[PDB]
Amino acid sequence: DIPQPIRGDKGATVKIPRNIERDRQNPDMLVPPETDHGTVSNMKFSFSDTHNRLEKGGYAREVTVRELPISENLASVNMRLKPGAIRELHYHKEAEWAYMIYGSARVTIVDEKGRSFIDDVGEGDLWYFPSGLPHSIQALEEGAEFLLVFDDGSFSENSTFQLTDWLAHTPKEVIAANFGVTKEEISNLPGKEKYIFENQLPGSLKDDIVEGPNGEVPYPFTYRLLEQEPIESEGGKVYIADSTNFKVSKTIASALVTVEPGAMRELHWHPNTHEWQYYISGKARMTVFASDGHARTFNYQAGDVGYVPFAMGHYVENIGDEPLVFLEIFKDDHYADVSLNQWLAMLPETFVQAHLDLGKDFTDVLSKEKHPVVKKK
Amino acid sequence: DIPQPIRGDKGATVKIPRNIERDRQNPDMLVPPETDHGTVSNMKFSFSDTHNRLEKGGYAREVTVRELPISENLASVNMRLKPGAIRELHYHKEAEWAYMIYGSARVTIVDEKGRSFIDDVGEGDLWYFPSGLPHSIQALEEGAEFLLVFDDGSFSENSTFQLTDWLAHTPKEVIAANFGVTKEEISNLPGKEKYIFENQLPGSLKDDIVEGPNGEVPYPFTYRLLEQEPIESEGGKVYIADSTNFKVSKTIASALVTVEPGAMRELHWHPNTHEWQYYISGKARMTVFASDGHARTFNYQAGDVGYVPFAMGHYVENIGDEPLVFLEIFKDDHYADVSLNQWLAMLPETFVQAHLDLGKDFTDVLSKEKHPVVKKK
Amino acid sequence: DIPQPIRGDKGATVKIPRNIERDRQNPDMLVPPETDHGTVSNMKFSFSDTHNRLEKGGYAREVTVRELPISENLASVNMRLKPGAIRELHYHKEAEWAYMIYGSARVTIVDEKGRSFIDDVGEGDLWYFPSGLPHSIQALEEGAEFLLVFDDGSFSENSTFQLTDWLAHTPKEVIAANFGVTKEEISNLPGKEKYIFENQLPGSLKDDIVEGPNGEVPYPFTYRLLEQEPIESEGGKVYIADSTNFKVSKTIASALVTVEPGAMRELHWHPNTHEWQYYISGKARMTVFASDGHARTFNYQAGDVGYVPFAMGHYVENIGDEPLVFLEIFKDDHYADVSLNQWLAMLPETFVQAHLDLGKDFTDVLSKEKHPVVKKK
Amino acid sequence: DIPQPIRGDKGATVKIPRNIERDRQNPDMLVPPETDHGTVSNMKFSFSDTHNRLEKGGYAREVTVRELPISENLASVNMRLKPGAIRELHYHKEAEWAYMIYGSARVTIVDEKGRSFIDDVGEGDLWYFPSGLPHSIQALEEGAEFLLVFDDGSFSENSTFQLTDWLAHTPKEVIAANFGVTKEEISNLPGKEKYIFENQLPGSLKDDIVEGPNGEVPYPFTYRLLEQEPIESEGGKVYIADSTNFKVSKTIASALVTVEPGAMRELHWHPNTHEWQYYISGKARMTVFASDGHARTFNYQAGDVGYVPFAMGHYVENIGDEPLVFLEIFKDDHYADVSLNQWLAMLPETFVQAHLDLGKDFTDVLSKEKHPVVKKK
Amino acid sequence: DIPQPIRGDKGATVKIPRNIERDRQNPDMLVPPETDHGTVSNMKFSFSDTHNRLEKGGYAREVTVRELPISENLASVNMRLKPGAIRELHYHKEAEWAYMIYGSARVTIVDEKGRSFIDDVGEGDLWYFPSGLPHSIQALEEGAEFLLVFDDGSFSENSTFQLTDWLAHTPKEVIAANFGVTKEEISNLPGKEKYIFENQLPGSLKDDIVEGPNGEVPYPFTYRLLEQEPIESEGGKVYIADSTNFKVSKTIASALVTVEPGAMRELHWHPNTHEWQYYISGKARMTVFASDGHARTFNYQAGDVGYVPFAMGHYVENIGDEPLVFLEIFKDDHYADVSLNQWLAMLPETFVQAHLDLGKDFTDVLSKEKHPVVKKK
Ligand SMILES: [Cl-]
Ligand SMILES: [Cl-]
Ligand SMILES: [Cl-]
Ligand SMILES: [Cl-]
Ligand SMILES: [Cl-]
Ligand SMILES: [Cl-]
Ligand SMILES: [Cl-]
Ligand SMILES: [Cl-]
Ligand SMILES: [Cl-]
Ligand SMILES: [Cl-]
Ligand SMILES: [Mn+2]
Ligand SMILES: [Mn+2]
Ligand SMILES: [Mn+2]
Ligand SMILES: [Mn+2]
Ligand SMILES: [Mn+2]
Ligand SMILES: [Mn+2]
Ligand SMILES: [Mn+2]
Ligand SMILES: [Mn+2]
Ligand SMILES: [Mn+2]
Ligand SMILES: [Mn+2]
Ligand code: NA
Ligand code: NA
Ligand code: NA
Ligand code: NA
Ligand code: NA
């Protein structure tokens, strides 16, 4: 039950003190496929290996370019809110995309024309807040836990502007002049940020809707991803949300992938941009093919972030007994992939045979229809 | 009448030789608000602190990233022309935006389809010359003084291509072949650039219009900013020109702001890009809130450049007895701001109260209409 | 037995699928000290989270700037050799430092004057190979497992030049001319690299010494670290090797630290350069103080790499029941530290009291002698 | 009395609102020499244009690469302390050099061998604290005001580690273990930094000297610059301190220059590194010659920072009625200059004549002795 | 006689218009060795492919990082002077090293203590001018042509400060004050640089020596390379000059290599830094081995610059009927190489046999003495 880095006549037993628990989580890294080769950047990081900021009302932990340097364009926060607790009104330079994993929450956003959008989001729903637009989150009666993705990997403390922090660092006489009140009237303003704070549960959504002289926002900032019809194939399902259906989501394209036991996200690549991954549940392995005979295999499980640099070939195999559920995230205005199977199926069979040194028995199995998740025979 | 860096029981008298004239211009820097905190980049530079290039016909001085390093994307020239004097036919890699502060001038531009645009510009008018399109300026009978803004902060001698400089560094036999003339016919070409040169006043605009086989340009390269209806609020006026109304101005969005004595440009931020400022007249202070409890206050007066990095919160207060007039410049295709007041006004009042630890007496003063310049009570 | 990110009235239970095994390894990251604050880069990475290259004869895995981006100046390989197995003759652009954790090995090196050094290294011994000098490793009868440290964090496949790889990519006619032999005489050269390969155990060291016309090397390339007298203090021992005693080790300074249960490497910083850490055995926590009120705590155990950026304050506490053993590595020609205790002990007591708002009862405990590892009372 | 940017038939009157006070301070920038040409970076910045941090006990303001981007390698703080006030025990990644302009202070420093140095510094004295060594400043009965120079232009809040800040962000149980005390015994530690704080005047220096088991420091960390014999020439004096006489000052070389009215620091350049300048008193102009026909003239007065990039030719002329006093600072282990006069004096006269198209009447005035400050005839 | 890119059954005839003259110069690039592989940067550039600056008195052309981007640290000028012509008094930020290929010249230099050095240099002699020290060159009765090497690859117009250019961009009143003369006395100064200018031949060297009050320079700035005893081996000679024998040459190490027909500079690498090459005469090929199975072969002839990045393996084979003469240049304080032959000769023979899969017949030919240039059998 003690694994060793041995493959046939290659490798040897570990002779120094070691981390057996981590080795058991990484079987394809302690003993990689013999087809791996060459230097490839790290493509895997666990939220469990990050500092958790604890507050009255919840917590937040992040995986950024300071943890996973291959991911320069995207960063992520795992945030948790207790029932009624508020993530303080704030904004960022980055656009923010979110997936609700557990529970439910009410969000607010106001746009640059002064129009307000207030909505409740449940498990499987998304939101997207464009760069610089101010927003808040308040958990409902079950609390909430969700994944935030920001479209800059350097996301840091310097990215986020909190309402009470701004006011605490503005001269009181200027605040008073701004609103037409006296300094005495604003003397009870907080002296520092709140960030996350406890609060009574709100009332019904309909009671919170604020009417305004500038009308309704043209497009909603939330999306019910799991209410859409997925792409179904023999081994699982894919739900896609990008700017073509979730109209406001102009800089983030996303897919939720479910892979049954014994199934795999097929060999494919993305012709548009890098892939950022979050593993919601289950256990996987992925080989990233990096060109020029370079390839490296990684293991993932719940709580891990993954990455596939622009156009590298890859697959995602379920290596456990439970369903594998993960997100594919892209900094682009649409989702796009090329399927290895479909590519070859759409070429003259003798041309494919000339490449692969295989016969009609192989080209006969190719499918001109794309099946993103396939089931083992 | 000698100011000292003392605020209550903090600070002390200056004991070394000092610049009292500059200290008097910078009262909120010698004695900042107690709400300032932390390292913030310099956001202020005076044209009076720059080298002035003097020529027969006028002068030019510039504030670039070599003077104000926070402004990497935008640079500016203050240029002056005597009556009739010509800024030599030239082009740049950068797009050029201009505001006519004093006097009037005739501009020419030819586009990449060979279409010509010639127009007169007066006080309060703009022009915008897209990258690489060749142009000239000639002052009319009052002379002219104007502000140029270029959409690269590294604007330098290497950005600008002058007609006579190009010809002076082209083999004479090639020039002759290009035009179908002899070398003798071009022997009087200048041996070096002119840049700015004296000239007789031109005739009437209508006599200068050149008709061509390629027709008129589809959109004009000048704009009468001060002839537009401004946004009026209790303390001043805002005139906006961006690509939605000044159609050719695709990379520069602008606003001219006037703030009466006792008034202020309200607390706001820009959700799209950095703000570059030029102070035409009057005296101001601005606090820039940089997130994570960082804030710094700056003083400005006529001839100063200011800056607000992308999405930082700010206000601009008139601290003098005369109107304050300044420009807000953005490298983007539209102007956008979020008002702190309007943001909070469009949220449920009890939610705002929970954030600010203030009551209904405060939320009752919030306005759902945006008022960019407010008047002190 | 299921840990939760809860500290008093802060934090909450985890509601999404999670990595409980990693959470148990990182108790001070799931529940940090309340004294932590602010954004700090990741300072921790496990060799168990890396791809292991398996060969006939052993294995090698690496932690580089592609895994741990804060460590730009230093990278490391964990290498294992079976009895008699050879790490092929090679050289690198980087200098190489090594610590023998398990077993023993014979090394060779030849310098730029053609002088050879051949020696056996056992547990607790070091070697240092200057940049560009060619070397080899061959394990003896117990095999060997050791830590290599290279003085560039970007250490990659492109850093290392193998004997047989060079020859395989040199025209055969040039090799033949170089050595004065025929192409037929070199026809059996390998067609690709070996890297690590199995081999019979060598004979006695004395039989391998090669005499040469250029004499002996002036300084040895191996060092018996654990044969030196350590600095002993109440809670452990420190063995230092830098260029002042291990003369050739000009770019790497090192210390082996042992910390008994209930003891800690005291609060200190390094005034010369960054610290790179490898945890040989045991379990630790460290808080890195990053200035300006920023601090973050990390957990470490056997197989982990740590890091402390230049001059940040830190301590290393044993949080387990077994001894804690780790290496402190520095890219410099000497080891240097400043002790917080010794610093304060060497100042006037009333001056220290004025800083700390503590009395003579505190300054009486300060020690003017440096004790690098202290024991809890 | 209103200056205009007019030189003969070049330039014109200013027609827009302007800063006449700054124009009067910058006569050679409003009206440059006709020999100036081309793009040259800004080489001038005033401490009066910076934010002043006010505390109980004094103030501090800084000029860094964020203000003066040409100065990437050096930054400076103007710091003021009231009588008895303390600049809190701290250290930096950067080396620190200082010149005492007004008053006097006591400094402490402890080195990496635990040796203490405590000394009083008066007007005209220097100190130098090597990178990472911890130190403090306490003003004596006159207070103190001084110039600090740090050998990295990016000097920021993140450069400096304060004693009480470190302790406030260290777990109390770790502090207690570090010193062998209880948590109750350290319960009164400050919760945040002090930075600068008021304190009673100290006793006599001799009473503060702390004896230690590690002996005295080998070289002193203070230097009496104005007690040295200066280089005297017809128009002023130069006092040099570099690592050849102020032995510890390995990364900063300095000169204090005094220039009488009607005198000038002669035409020269530095063959080793960039020059950073601080103007203590008086009024100057300097032309920087940047090669390839580029040159720009700058004005300076008390409180200004100047700069001369590596090897650019320059002079510093007194343009006022009082003595001109300034510092020349270099990030190097020695001071070096080449004098234009001495250079030409040491060449064959007919060779110099062939270059300059001048005769023996000119070469007869050249001097083979270097005179750094010359007096007008 | 028309070469084609065909090697056995690989390659094909060229079907498009082509440069047959260049193909004939590059036989090992049109048809590389089959042992070449992979992407390798360009390592070859011809002075004949550069712009030649022509002046009255000579010419100058350069190969810099703008031509050969792999060479970031070193750049070179081929300069020619007619009899008596002068390269104008000047200095640079870079150190300058030179090899006299044709003719002879007189150089001057003055150091930072005002000491002068004047000397004549002939064919095969060197000079080295440290950074920032001012110098001149004047050809004697045969004229001169020489190679300059500067220790920054970005060497450009902005690197060099000319005497008359500096004076032309300094206010006349400042020049007059600097020297104690009137403006009328300097009215005939040149209005622009000379750079290279014609002049009468100088007198005898002894008549030019300028005596000074500061004594003689401690070390000479010229070196007679070809008067030294070379390393001789069967196929050629190597003359080395670095800071250990040419004492002032602290940043440039050099070797002049002569390779007879049928000989080769042996397989070796440099453990210290990059190699920069200039081919004085003859024809060569070199394969650069770049690690990880990458290698590329280049052709060189008179007038070419070559390069070998730090530690890459290489050889230089004479592929013509005349001697091959080239320079090896290094930015370091010493020359160092490792010989492949000597390396293997200094190891146990059975250990080498185990690596190469060759027998005693091969290890018997290895030599423990280094022979830098070997002759084919
Ligand atoms: Cl206030
Ligand atoms: Cl409402
Ligand atoms: Cl011509
Ligand atoms: Cl016409
Ligand atoms: Cl061959
Ligand atoms: Cl032997
Ligand atoms: Cl505690
Ligand atoms: Cl004591
Ligand atoms: Cl003059
Ligand atoms: Cl003489
Ligand atoms: Mn957010
Ligand atoms: Mn994918
Ligand atoms: Mn223009
Ligand atoms: Mn604004
Ligand atoms: Mn090695
Ligand atoms: Mn340490
Ligand atoms: Mn300090
Ligand atoms: Mn100087
Ligand atoms: Mn030169
Ligand atoms: Mn070589
Ligand atoms: Na990073
Ligand atoms: Na800059
Ligand atoms: Na990296
Ligand atoms: Na800067
Ligand atoms: Na280049």
Author numbering:
A (entry chain A), B (entry chain A), C (entry chain A), D (entry chain A), E (entry chain A): 6 to 382
Kindly provide excerpts from the paper associated with this entry.
The hexameric low-pH stress response enzyme oxalate decarboxylase catalyzes the decarboxylation of the oxalate mono-anion in the soil bacterium Bacillus subtilis. A single protein subunit contains two Mn-binding cupin domains, and catalysis depends on Mn(III) at the N-terminal site. A π-stacked tryptophan pair (W96/W274) links two neighboring protein subunits together, thus reducing the Mn-to-Mn distance from 25.9 Å (intrasubunit) to 21.5 Å (intersubunit). The present study suggests a mechanistic function for the C-terminal Mn as an electron hole donor for the N-terminal Mn.
Site-directed replacement of tryptophan by phenylalanine was used to inactivate LRET while replacement with tyrosine was used as a potential positive control owing to its similar reduction potential compared with tryptophan. Since tyrosine has a redox potential similar to that of tryptophan it was expected to rescue activity. Of interest, the single W→Y mutants (W96Y and W274Y) have predicted hopping rates approximately the same as in the WT simulations, confirming our premise that replacing tryptophan with tyrosine will have little effect on the overall electron hopping rates, assuming that a proton acceptor is available to establish a neutral tyrosyl radical as the hopping intermediate. As expected, the W→Y single mutations rescue catalytic efficiency to almost WT levels. X-ray crystallography was carried out on single crystals of the W96F and W96Y forms to determine the structure of the W mutant proteins. W96F and W96Y mutants share the wildtype tertiary structure. Significantly, the π-stacking of W274 with the substituted phenylalanine (W96F) and tyrosine (W96Y) aromatic ring system was conserved. The average distance of the aromatic planes within each dimer differed only marginally by ∼ 0.1 Å or less. X-ray crystallography was used to confirm that the quaternary structure was not significantly disturbed by the mutations.
